[PDB]
Nucleic acid binder design. Structure first.
Ligand SMILES: OC[C@H]1O[C@@](CO)(O[C@H]2O[C@H](CO)[C@@H](O)[C@H](O)[C@H]2O)[C@@H](O)[C@@H]1O
Ligand SMILES: OC[C@H]1O[C@@](CO)(O[C@H]2O[C@H](CO)[C@@H](O)[C@H](O)[C@H]2O)[C@@H](O)[C@@H]1O
Ligand code: MG
Length: 580
DNA sequence: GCGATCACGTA
DNA sequence: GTACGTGATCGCA
């Protein structure tokens, strides 16, 4: 049942039609400066397989690749685009990306290869990449006959599937979402990943030595307090010391033993001095292993830059994820960890890091979607939302709001966005269900619009089978009808949260597209480096800071128009840490 | 070599 | 109670 195709030894005119399914295969998971093992082109004239050495050296082919008028349909065009950027070749004219199309149609499918997307439309004349390349150690590029066959079948699948996918996207009112949001963003993410972020490796290594020193001290202190040595990083060995040798109370159990999570340890601190030391060890050890050593392992030795890969088709809510390294979870909450950011520096001398972040975008989005009068007014007055919530749920004036009252109102606001639950709020604020329930009840009394939204959105998820975001992203919630309380409740929380987190994702994605257009129009050298859900990190000549101070916030604030204003704070400095 | 567990970093 | 990714340990191949 082999598929017919030409194993070309040279590029020909018919291979450069103005519309084609293109496969520029990069097998290495991390495509940065990675090899392109083969190329397949399927168009009106037939199916072709070209060896990369040949194709990429052919002037006509490279010109075809960069010609925006020559339209290409692909799967994960960003992967190809970045791999090509590393070879100094521009990819343009990608009008359809099956990966992104599949992702928008149903994020839950976990589509990560052409075969998975094709299976959505009962097309199975293509093999899963894992079947062809294997995984782990067994992973390898098969001989040309097998490789060529696979790439051609993928291009053929893309060629056949474009119409049906676009048709369904259109029915879902997601056609613009793909064409005007995700696909253009893909090119922006490609530029960001390729540009990378410069790392001050000397600073990291210095912090590592200081940490190693402190860690040794705390480590020895722990052995001294426990009366023996053991693997502190072993929750099993640690559990024996804590709950057996030291007789500390067992307040929380895990699935396979005693729990030793930070939340549990905090409660045990009053009983033994060893606890605070374990907590300190946990903090320093996390920085050392994950942010000092982990980061140093992925820094390109030549450029000293880290090139993350933003997975644009993974999260169930529309957010991006970041890997190798993850640049969306660099420490900031605790000062010791926050200093890690001093290692992220501008890529050129006399340039600076500029960071802009939305202030409470999720709650502003909630105010908009729920049309809660009280909540919308609060933002229209740009009030401290946590103090305002405390004032309302505890019924007091601003001056009567104590720090603990704001702390709890803050916790309530988080729960509301995540899918409020008396049990959940209880565990978080360490109080009884009855108490937590009363807080939630008080919240809804003050924000009836939000209560109505939470009730209505769950009902809608059940009626339609899914929930949507501001820009029409969708997430199916089949569990919304489960007769199992736990399974159903999780789906209900997703119904409440997805439109919020998802709409916030839509907004910043459009902001990125709008920003890049503005930067180009102004011919600024400034460029995006990272996106961390509700913030954009750029770098630019120190001479562009004043213009960026006005331009970036405005573009982000004007990405979409809501019933409440969007507010963006911004800072800049010599390092990411200093952009505060 | 792999993957389940537990842990913890972010918004 | 939302959404993620990475690393140390550990027991089975
Ligand atoms: O290229 C990113 C794109 O590829 C997928 C598979 O189609 O993920 C692959 O590449 C990621 C980046 O290296 C890895 O984290 C992942 O494990 C690997 O399968 C998509 O999920 C993603 O959108
Ligand atoms: O008591 C109604 C109240 O319960 C929630 C869960 O907190 O939903 C339950 O009741 C609905 C009927 O009104 C069902 O459709 C739903 O499946 C069930 O879990 C809230 O959404 C609702 O306001
Ligand atoms: Mg913020």
């Amino acid at each position: 049942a082999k598929m017919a195709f030409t194993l070309a030894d040279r590029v020909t005119e018919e291979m450069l039609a103005d519309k084609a399914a293109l496969v520029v295969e990069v097998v290495e998971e991390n495509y940065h400066d990675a090899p392109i093992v083969g190329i397949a082109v399927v168009n009106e004239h037939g199916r072709f397989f070209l060896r990369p050495e040949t194709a990429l050296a052919d002037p006509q082919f490279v010109a075809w690749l960069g010609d925006e008028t020559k339209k290409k349909s692909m799967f994960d065009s960003k992967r190809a685009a970045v791999a090509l950027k590393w070879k100094g070749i521009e990819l343009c004219g990608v009008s359809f990306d099956l990966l992104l199309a599949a992702y928008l149609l149903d994020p839950a499918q976990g589509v990560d290869d052409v075969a998975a997307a094709a299976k959505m439309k009962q097309y199975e004349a293509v093999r899963p990449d894992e079947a062809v390349y294997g995984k782990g150690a067994k992973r390898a590029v098969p001989d040309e006959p097998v490789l060529a066959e696979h790439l051609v079948r993928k291009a053929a699948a893309i060629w056949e599937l474009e119409r049906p996918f676009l048709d369904e996207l259109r029915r879902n009112e997601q056609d613009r979402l793909l064409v005007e949001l995700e696909q253009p963003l893909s090119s922006i993410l490609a530029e960001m990943e390729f540009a990378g972020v410069k790392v001050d490796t000397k600073r990291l290594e210095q912090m590592g030595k200081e940490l190693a020193e402190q860690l040794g001290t705390v480590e020895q202190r722990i052995y001294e307090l426990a009366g023996q040595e053991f693997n502190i990083n072993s929750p099993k060995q640690l559990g024996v010391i804590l709950f057996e040798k030291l007789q500390l109370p067992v307040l929380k159990k895990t699935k396979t033993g005693y729990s030793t999570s930070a939340d549990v340890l905090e409660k045990l601190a009053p009983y033994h001095e060893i606890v605070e030391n374990i907590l300190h060890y946990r903090q320093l050890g996390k920085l050392q292993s994950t942010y000092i050593e982990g980061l140093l392992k992925v820094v390109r030795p030549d450029t000293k830059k880290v090139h993350t890969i933003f997975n644009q088709a993974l999260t169930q809510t529309g957010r991006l994820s970041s890997t190798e390294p993850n640049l969306q979870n660099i420490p900031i909450r605790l000062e010791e960890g926050r200093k890690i950011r001093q290692a992220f520096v501008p890529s050129e001398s006399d340039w600076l890091i500029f960071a802009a972040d939305y202030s409470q975008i999720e709650l502003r989005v909630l105010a908009h979607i729920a049309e809660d009068d009280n909540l919308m007014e609060a933002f229209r007055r740009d009030l401290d939302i946590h103090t305002k919530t405390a004032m309302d749920i505890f019924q007091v004036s601003e001056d009567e709001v104590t720090p603990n009252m704001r702390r709890q109102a803050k916790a309530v606001n988080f729960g509301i966005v995540y899918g409020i639950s008396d049990y959940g709020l209880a565990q978080n604020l360490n109080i009884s269900r009855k108490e937590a329930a009363e807080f939630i009840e008080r919240y809804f009394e003050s924000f009836p619009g939000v209560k109505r939204y939470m009730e209505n959105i769950v009902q809608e998820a059940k009626q339609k089978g899914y929930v949507t975001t501001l820009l029409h992203r969708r997430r199916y919630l089949p569990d919304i009808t489960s007769r199992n309380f736990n399974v159903r409740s999780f789906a209900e929380r997703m119904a409440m949260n997805t439109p919020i987190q998802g709409s916030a994702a839509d907004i910043i994605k459009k902001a990125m597209i709008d920003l890049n257009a503005r930067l180009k129009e102004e011919r600024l050298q400034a460029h995006l480096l990272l996106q961390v859900h509700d913030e954009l990190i750029l770098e630019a000549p120190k001479e562009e800071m004043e213009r960026l101070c006005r331009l970036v916030p405005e573009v982000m604030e004007q990405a979409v128009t809501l019933r409440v204003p969007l507010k963006v704070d911004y800072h800049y400095g010599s390092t990411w840490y200093d952009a505060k």
